[PDB]
Amino acid sequence: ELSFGARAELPRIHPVASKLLRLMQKKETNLCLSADVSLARELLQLADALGPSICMLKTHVDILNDFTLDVMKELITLAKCHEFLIFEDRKFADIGNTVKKQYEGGIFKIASWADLVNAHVVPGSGVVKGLQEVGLPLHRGCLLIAEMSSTGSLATGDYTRAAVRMAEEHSEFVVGFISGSRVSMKPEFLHLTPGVQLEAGGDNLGQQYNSPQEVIGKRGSDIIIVGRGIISAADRLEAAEMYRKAAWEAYLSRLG
Amino acid sequence: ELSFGARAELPRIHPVASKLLRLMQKKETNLCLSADVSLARELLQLADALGPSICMLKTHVDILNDFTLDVMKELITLAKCHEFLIFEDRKFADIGNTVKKQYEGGIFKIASWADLVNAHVVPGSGVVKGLQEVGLPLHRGCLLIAEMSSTGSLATGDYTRAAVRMAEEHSEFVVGFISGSRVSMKPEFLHLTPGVQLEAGGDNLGQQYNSPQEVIGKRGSDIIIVGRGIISAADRLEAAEMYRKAAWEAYLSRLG
Ligand SMILES: O=C(O)c1cc(=O)[nH]c(=O)n1[C@@H]1O[C@H](COP(=O)(O)O)[C@@H](O)[C@H]1O
Numbered sequence: 049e050l051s052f053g054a055r056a057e058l059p060r061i062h063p064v065a066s067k068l069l070r071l072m073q074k075k076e077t078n079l080c081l082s083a084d085v086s087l088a089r090e091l092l093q094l095a096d097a098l099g100p101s102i103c104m105l106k107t108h109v110d111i112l113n114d115f116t117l118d119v120m121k122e123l124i125t126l127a128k129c130h131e132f133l134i135f136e137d138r139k140f141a142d143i144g145n146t147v148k149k150q151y152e153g154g155i156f157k158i159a160s161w162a163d164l165v166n167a168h169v170v171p172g173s174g175v176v177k178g179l180q181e182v183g184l185p186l187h188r189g190c191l192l193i194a195e196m197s198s199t200g201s202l203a204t205g206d207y208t209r210a211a212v213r214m215a216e217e218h219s220e221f222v223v224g225f226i227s228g229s230r231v232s233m234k235p236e237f238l239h240l241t242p243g244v245q246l247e248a249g250g251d252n253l254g255q256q257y258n259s260p261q262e263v264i265g266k267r268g269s270d271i272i273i274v275g276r277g278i279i280s281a282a283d284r285l286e287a288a289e290m291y292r293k294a295a296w297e298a299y300l301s302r303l304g
Numbered sequence: 305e306l307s308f309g310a311r312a313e314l315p316r317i318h319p320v321a322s323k324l325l326r327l328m329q330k331k332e333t334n335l336c337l338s339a340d341v342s343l344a345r346e347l348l349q350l351a352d353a354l355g356p357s358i359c360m361l362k363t364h365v366d367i368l369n370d371f372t373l374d375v376m377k378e379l380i381t382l383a384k385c386h387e388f389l390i391f392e393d394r395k396f397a398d399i400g401n402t403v404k405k406q407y408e409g410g411i412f413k414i415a416s417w418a419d420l421v422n423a424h425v426v427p428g429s430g431v432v433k434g435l436q437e438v439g440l441p442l443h444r445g446c447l448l449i450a451e452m453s454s455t456g457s458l459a460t461g462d463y464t465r466a467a468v469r470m471a472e473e474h475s476e477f478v479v480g481f482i483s484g485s486r487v488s489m490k491p492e493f494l495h496l497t498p499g500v501q502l503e504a505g506g507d508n509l510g511q512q513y514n515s516p517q518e519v520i521g522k523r524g525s526d527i528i529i530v531g532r533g534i535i536s537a538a539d540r541l542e543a544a545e546m547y548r549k550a551a552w553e554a555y556l557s558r559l560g
Pocket residue numbers: 142143146338340362364393422451452453454482498499500511529530531532533
């Protein structure tokens with residue numbers, strides 16, 4: 049097992065993965081903030097205050113009541129200042145010809161500001177081929193959704209294996225997974241795990257939580273994605289630091 | 305087998321399905337236009353000219369370069385005038401808590417103007433529960449993606465069966481399927497089939513085509529969804545009429 053800093057130098061590493069792994073090592077953070085807010089001002093205030101604590105800020109641009117491309121410009125300023133990647137959790141899941149348009153165009157112009165996006169594998173590899181036509185020239189990366197945190201997820205068994213094969217066959221663009229665990233044995237790939245809180249529980253709409261120690265330490269994932277465990281807390285900075293320290297120590301203790 | 309007009313009266317029919325089936329029978333159309341354009345003016349000119357020929361206009365609001373809510377008001381005026389449903393092909397595919405916000409909120413406010421949306425079943429039934437918490441109060445309907453037209457689709461076998469079970473257990477909100485074929489034996493459910501052209505072929509990014517006669521007549525689906533077969537033609541009205549007549553006669557001949 050290699051450190052994040054050594055994985056950043058692997059021969060087959062994608063440049064976006066390398067940039068991420070280097071800043072994870074530098075800042076001692078494997079925390080991705082899930083910035084699940086509806087106001088641009090709250091998004092930017094969280095990005096600025098929590099930027100030093102996070103390796104990545106995950107967006108849902110389509111829930112931002114006051115989205116503009118200028119908001120994204122300000123978020124990029126903070127991402128560059130504090131050193132974190134921007135991941136738009138768009139979950140592209142259409143035919144290749146459609147997702148290329150959804151990624152490059154429309155009002156969001158996601159490819160113009162998102163370092164990372166993700167895709168479901170259920171449509172077959174055309175979803176990746178469509179995205180990569182926009183993303184490769186724009187030097188972007190993609191995560192494939194191999195496992196999901198929600199109750200009744202069908203992303204199990206052969207489905208998960210199909211996601212890993214699709215990633216390993218599109219390594220010029222796919223840099224890792226959304227998963228609950230390590231699903232690829234290739235250290236070039238990132239594993240990002242949502243459904244994370246310190247306390248046991250879930251929500252009323254099928255979300256299930258596991259702890260940072262469980263998903264990083266026992267299940268071998270790289271990065272925790274945390275929304276409400278931070279966002280709903282009174283002090284979001286202290287909450288982010290709790291999650292960062294939990295995920296970082298779980299990583300160190302698996303390393304030895 | 306019942307006519308569209310008789311299916312509109314079934315005891316368990318959803319009001320959105322009933323409205324659709326009645327206008328399909330009245331206008332002799334089971335064609336859904338896939339309005340895959342980037343200009344509001346082209347979207348509205350197609351909706352106006354092709355409105356009499358279609359039962360439904362399917363949008364990808366996120367590829368419109370000049371989206372505003374006033375464009376959607378103008379589209380609703382045309383939908384009411386010519387009598388067709390608006391279907392936003394958003395393919396919701398996240399946890400329930402997230403999709404409720406993506407459906408109601410953000411810039412697009414999809415639930416405010418879309419009669420129908422669709423969802424992938426891969427996250428489990430929380431995706432439907434989240435949507436239905438916005439959609440039920442707004443008297444909307446949902447389609448579940450049971451099969452996909454693209455090469456390498458994983459929406460087969462047990463996956464398709466899971467989509468049918470999820471639909472039949474959420475019949476207060478789910479009105480049918482995106483599928484390549486009849487997947488439910490319950491006549492209350494609509495089957496809408498994309499990947500349709502008169503000529504054999506595909507695209508460069510995994511799309512596969514079958515004819516209206518194949519998908520309506522042999523595979524037992526209700527509605528054809530047609531994009532490029534119409535949109536890329538010079539005379540889009542004549543193209544829509546050719547697809548309408550093909551799908552309608554295939555339906556009549558299976559009725560006998
Ligand atoms: O839900 C959809 O309509 C959909 C499902 C599917 O299996 N395949 C599929 O192509 N679609 C959509 O249907 C349309 C097909 O367009 P054309 O290939 O140009 O006719 C596109 O807008 C797709 O996003």
